Amino acid sequence: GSLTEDGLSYKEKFVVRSYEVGSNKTATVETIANLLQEVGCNHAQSVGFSFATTTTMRKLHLIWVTARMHIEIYKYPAWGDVVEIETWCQSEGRIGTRRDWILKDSVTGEVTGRATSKWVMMNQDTRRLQKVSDDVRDEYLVFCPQEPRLAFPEENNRSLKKIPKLEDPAQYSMIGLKPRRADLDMNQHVNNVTYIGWVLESIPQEIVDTHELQVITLDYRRECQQDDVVDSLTTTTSDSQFLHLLRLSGDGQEINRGTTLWRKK
Amino acid sequence: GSLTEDGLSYKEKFVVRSYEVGSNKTATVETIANLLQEVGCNHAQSVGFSFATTTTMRKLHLIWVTARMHIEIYKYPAWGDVVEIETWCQSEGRIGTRRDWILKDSVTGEVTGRATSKWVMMNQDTRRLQKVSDDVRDEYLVFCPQEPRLAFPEENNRSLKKIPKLEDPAQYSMIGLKPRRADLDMNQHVNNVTYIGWVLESIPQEIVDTHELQVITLDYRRECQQDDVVDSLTTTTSNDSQFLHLLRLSGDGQEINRGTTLWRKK
Ligand SMILES: CN(C)S(=O)(=O)c1cccnc1
């Protein structure tokens, strides 16, 4: 991949792999989310941020953490197809940062998906969320477009909707989910794509067989440790809409909450 | 990727991804095994197949299944590195087929890994193994080198060693392992790379932190269903550390896999 001409965004092409597709021979939403993360990492490397912590952040032991992830897919690329992903970032004042993505069919040039994510600053050791400092914001502003550039521009759209907490009893559940070493990143933390898979595990197999996932919105509240056990809960709220909740098996401590939207094939 | 000049082997280059690496910033053995499967699938597609089912196999409802997988890694590629993989197949008479791989550093040209796998023919519906018929063998022989070409040629080598069954009690164990939808392939069967991860789950974290996996040999006895639960068992058998492995169903203890791993100090 490479930065665009202005150096304010990054593009990369991916050929969809055999083990990356589901029963419809098209990429799963977890493959999509892995590709978004990969192009995001490559964008940070290309502009000198060898995740994307500034020099001031490293000094104060500060990192970027995902607070919200929102994905909308129109067409899932088929096995062997080339998908082009463009990514860019933007300052969100002082409450955090935003990373957006546009997915296109490399052959037709048509938009087949779009994603947005909200990131917040956190002390890596105490896990205490912070507001972004002035001297921190000026070292990454020069790498962002100055005028607003939104993957989800529409005034009051799905990407910024408030998500409620699922009430017991859940309609559906998948209990005792544990991460394995493949679910951990290079820093031994559970990678955020695993939570998408765990949320989707409580959706019944018949819904997966007859519908395609169009929208997924996820709020990240707490991280899951490598020795933690998770329960995945789903209730239909409706196209089919579902309310989701991931919580620790024992005490029931909330780790995630979300919503999915599915349309008949 | 592409077939070589003679059309008897296939090469493909891969750039190692961020989520594909472990704590050392190098590709995991599961990333390697996924790449081997991907280049294998692309080789079958490039020569006219659609996995590697001949016309006679489709007529009789027959498929290729892995019986044994053997991987030896000298250097795991780092994140952002380009790895080149060459793959080819060879008929093993009526026993079945063999698929071999060579992994090279694209910049240095040096061999950094090699793998071999034994495949057997099975009826899709009854799951009954069978020998390769003459009609089937002639349909794929023209796509293989005629003279032997072995990734593991050595007259006394690890790839053909008999693996014993682990005896209870196991030294280490990881219980209650279940596959999720990400662990299933396009035909909704548990992907063979998941079994490698499940085998590795019973290795203690301190061994993983201080050693690197050099060799892994896996025998496939039975498939794990999407609603099945697995127990992973390990016992040390040994500088280098060797382990004996066993995957079995949580309930009745029905064997699904058995294997051995070899690790060297970093
Ligand atoms: C400069 N890049 C666009 S980036 O993705 O590395 C980034 C974005 C926001 C904060 N810090 C770094």
Ligand SMILES: CN(C)S(=O)(=O)c1cccnc1
């Ligand atoms: C590339 N081909 C040699 S292949 O892998 O499709 C194959 C191998 C053995 C049997 N049938 C098909």
